[PDB]
Design a protein around this ligand. Structure first.
Ligand code: RZJ
Ligand code: ZN
Length: 140
């Protein structure tokens, strides 16, 4: 579990979005496993605006933050998970690291702020859904 809290927006894995998220929907994309909902209080997170490929991510199944190198976002064949079929996911970044299903929502951060959230796992990789192309998270 985990979210990004930027302005009056809550960014979560689409597959973990709650009824309240869907009832207060701003934007969602199944291809990228992302959903954004509205918030009452303003959030503490800043979104990175950058092409960094190094950062740190939180791994709940280890209670640890790990430094990683990651790819720029791509269309990656993701093997079957407990929450998704074997399928293609867009705007996905991969790193070598530990990821189990419950690690979804962990933040990846660079020197510029929040890059994305854990979205995929298995076979010694962790995948992150990128948010840095969502400039509209910074305004309105
Ligand atoms: C929209 N466009 C161009 C700019 C950045 C970017 C990154 C990933 C993907 S993709 N192939 O995962 O849909 C598409 C894309
Ligand atoms: Zn950066």
């Amino acid at each position: 579990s985990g979210a990004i809290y930027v302005g009056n927006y809550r960014v979560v894995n689409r597959h973990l979005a709650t009824h309240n998220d869907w009832a207060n929907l701003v934007w969602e994309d199944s291809s990228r496993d992302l959903l954004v909902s509205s918030t009452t209080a303003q959030g503490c997170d800043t979104i990175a605006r950058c092409d960094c490929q190094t950062g740190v991510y939180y791994c709940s199944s280890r209670r640890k933050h790990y430094p990683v190198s990651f790819s720029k976002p791509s269309l990656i064949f993701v093997e079957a998970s407990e929450y998704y079929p074997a399928r293609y996911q867009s705007h996905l970044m991969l790193a070598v690291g530990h990821s189990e299903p419950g690690d979804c929502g962990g933040i990846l951060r660079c020197q510029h702020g929040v890059v994305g959230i854990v979205s995929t796992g298995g076979n010694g990789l962790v995948g992150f859904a990128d948010v840095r192309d969502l400039l509209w998270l910074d305004e309105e």
